[PDB]
Amino acid sequence: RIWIVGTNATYPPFEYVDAQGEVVGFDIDLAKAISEKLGKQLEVREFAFDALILNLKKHRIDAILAGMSITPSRQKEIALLPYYGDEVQELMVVSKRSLETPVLPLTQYSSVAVQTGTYQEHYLLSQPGICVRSFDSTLEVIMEVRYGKSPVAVLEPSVGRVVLKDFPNLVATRLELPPECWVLGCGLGVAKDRPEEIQTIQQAITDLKSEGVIQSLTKKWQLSEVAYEAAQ
Ligand SMILES: NC(=[NH2+])NCCC[C@H](N)C(=O)O
């Protein structure tokens, strides 16, 4: 009957809280489409990002849609079905335009702002000489920079490309990741002991891709490289 998708709505444009108090975004739109393919009614529930895997494992939720990067370590705990993105080999470092080059390396700073429980936080914490401050939300991370409280932050590029549009005084610099910290694109999480749901859900994703629904949705939430609309 009900299909519970766990998420952490802290994370534009995948899932976040709008001006009205409503949870919206690319993942939410996808969860809606998928639940329709599944014959089930969608319910979205909020958890801390780091709590999602355990809830899923325990079947306190039925799936995860949380912009969750595919990594081997996560794959040991659950299934992650590819639905967006490609390999990530770099990160953005955000700073005020006023901050003098070189922005790199990150060891030069009093702190570096980053979102909690994320692979990019774990990268920073494994590097020598980085003082990390971690926050609930992407906005908090960026506000920490524009408010002068951290000289720099780190975002994922797919996220940074979208969010930084609204901050004309911030600038972003590529920071290549060591190949041992490259991750894959985003996967929809399903418990590993549920193969039947895996297949069903995999088939819903392939169907939405075929139908052009996933392309529409990636455009709608600015997750695709922008194309021109050409009259033919
Ligand atoms: N809804 C969220 N808070 N998502 C955070 C995902 C960040 C990054 N893609 C990771 O998987 O570690």
Curated annotation (Swiss-Prot):
Coiled coil: none annotated. L-arginine binds at N8, E15, A66, G67, S69, R74, Y119. The keyword Transport applies. This is Probable ABC transporter arginine-binding protein ArtJ. GO terms for cellular component: cell surface; extracellular region. Keywords: Amino-acid transport, Secreted, Signal, Transport. It is found in: Secreted; Cell surface. Probably part of an ABC transporter complex involved in arginine transport. Binds arginine. Interacts with host epithelial cells, suggesting a role in host-cell adhesion during infection. Contains two domains, D1 and D2, which are both exposed on the surface and bind to epithelial cells. CDD domains: PBP2_ArtJ. One of its GO terms (biological process) is amino acid transport. Was identified as a potential vaccine component. In vitro, induces antibodies capable of neutralizing the infectivity of C.pneumoniae. Belongs to the bacterial solute-binding protein 3 family. The gene is artJ. SUPFAM superfamilies: Periplasmic binding protein-like II. It comes from Chlamydia pneumoniae (Chlamydophila pneumoniae). The keyword Signal applies. It comes from the Bacteria. This protein, although well conserved among chlamydial species, shows species-specific immunogenicity.
